[PDB]
């Protein structure tokens, strides 16, 4: 388990939380071994071009590993995994100046199925988590890649069910934005 | 450093049809020991990535065994025999036999599945985003395919081209289609001088637009 999102400002440094492996993925890219290290013996092994990038400086007390970054360049944004074969959750590094902004969320009411939506929108940095009814409606459902707009994303979702059941059996778009530590749960209701 | 190839970026197949990516490492991943440290994963939209082969050919626990991979000492094949729709994703080869690890570049599957026209609907904005001043129009083309697709907004009959944005998804995991969503933003006073608003899709599948269009004085 690895926190959601690190907003550091270019220059800053990073301490991130988790045989310990790292790699490192930029959006829409591939992977790279960044290095393993091992709690045991706090015996640390880098990969070259990241040895003068990174730290795999464990901790026994927390029985977690860490990875720490020193000065970040938007060439150090990117997705963050600390595995085990036991995958992390990543965490989405984004080096950039702006400050964090939690979205704003509006419901998407229309006017034999029917389409709602959820637009999330006006918020820094990525990532966005969204679900519909705690994730019990998931087979209608498609979420939209956020676009980057005036140093702001803008995410949308659909979800599209039989027509007879809405508004009778209620629809609810949930966004957590890991960043700001916010949630916003939005039933969607008729116009 | 050990070098891993994928010569293709992408492979497409029909559902229920056998497909293989090929890899390639500069070194032998064979091991005195006899094993050949060589990974497969899977990685979708949004996941971490997800072992299906390790040791060259060995079937991941809890991966289904249409899954196999094959090969020589630097010539590796992954076999997906009567692919799925949730097969759909990127998959790497991962050699881990020397330090360095690295991996290949990776190969997007690629479903091939009947032509289908898009769903569009078209959305005014929330009472809340007016309350803050904003005014966003949301159109989705849903469960279209090919991926290429079209979208036009109409303001009062004048189209318009600034303040639209779209995303489009990966492809869909359940059918093979595509979905894209276009926004046009404009700010509440805008949005109160104008009654028409306008989304034009225009799809492979056919030669006349899909059409969706409501009247703020409805």
């Known amino acids: 388990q690895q926190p959601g999102a690190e907003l550091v400002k270019p220059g800053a440094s990073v301490k991130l939380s988790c045989?310990i492996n790292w790699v490192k993925q930029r959006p829409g890219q591939g992977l790279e071994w960044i290095g393993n290290?091992?709690?045991?013996?706090?015996?640390?092994n880098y990969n070259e071009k990241f040895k003068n990038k990174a730290t795999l400086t464990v901790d026994t007390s927390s029985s977690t590993a860490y990875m720490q970054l020193s000065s970040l360049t938007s060439d150090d944004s990117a997705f963050y995994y600390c595995?085990?074969?036991?995958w992390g959750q990543g965490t989405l590094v984004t080096v950039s100046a702006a400050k964090t902004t939690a979205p704003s969320v509006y419901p998407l009411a229309p006017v034999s199925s029917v389409t709602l939506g959820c637009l999330v929108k006006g918020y820094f940095p990525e990532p966005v988590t969204l679900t519909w009814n705690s994730g019990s409606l998931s087979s209608g459902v498609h979420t939209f890649p956020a676009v980057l707009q005036s140093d702001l994303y803008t995410l949308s979702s659909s979800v599209t069910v039989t027509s007879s059941t809405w508004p009778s059996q209620s629809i609810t778009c949930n966004v957590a934005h890991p960043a700001s530590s916010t949630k916003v749960d939005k039933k969607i209701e008729p116009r | 450093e050990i070098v891993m190839t994928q010569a293709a970026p992408s492979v497409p197949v029909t559902p229920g049809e056998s497909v293989s990516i090929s890899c390639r490492s500069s070194?032998?991943?064979?091991?005195?020991?006899?094993?050949?440290?060589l990974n497969w994963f899977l990685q979708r939209p949004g996941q971490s990535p997800q072992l299906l082969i390790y040791?060259?050919?060995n079937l991941a626990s809890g991966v289904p065994d249409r899954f196999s991979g094959s090969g020589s000492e630097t010539a590796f094949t992954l076999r997906t025999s009567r692919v799925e729709a949730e097969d759909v994703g990127v998959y790497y080869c991962?050699?881990?036999?020397?330090?360095?690890?690295?991996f290949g570049s990776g190969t997007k599957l690629e479903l091939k599945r009947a032509d289908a026209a898009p769903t569009v609907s078209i959305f005014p904005p929330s009472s809340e985003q007016l309350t803050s001043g904003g005014a966003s129009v949301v159109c989705f083309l849903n469960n279209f395919y090919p991926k290429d697709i079209n979208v036009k907004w109409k303001i009062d009959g004048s189209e318009r081209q600034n303040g639209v944005l779209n995303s489009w998804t990966d492809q869909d995991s359940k059918d093979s289609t595509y979905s894209m969503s276009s926004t046009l933003t404009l700010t509440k006073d805008e949005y109160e001088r104008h009654n028409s608003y306008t989304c034009e899709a225009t799809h492979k599948t056919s030669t006349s637009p899909i059409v969706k269009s409501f009247n703020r004085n409805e």
């Open positions: 290290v091992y709690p045991g013996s706090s015996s640390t």
């Open positions: 991962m050699q881990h036999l020397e330090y360095p690890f690295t």
């Open positions: 040791r060259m050919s």
């Open positions: 595995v085990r074969p036991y």
């Open positions: 045989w």
């Open positions: 070194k032998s991943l064979l091991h005195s020991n006899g094993n050949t440290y």
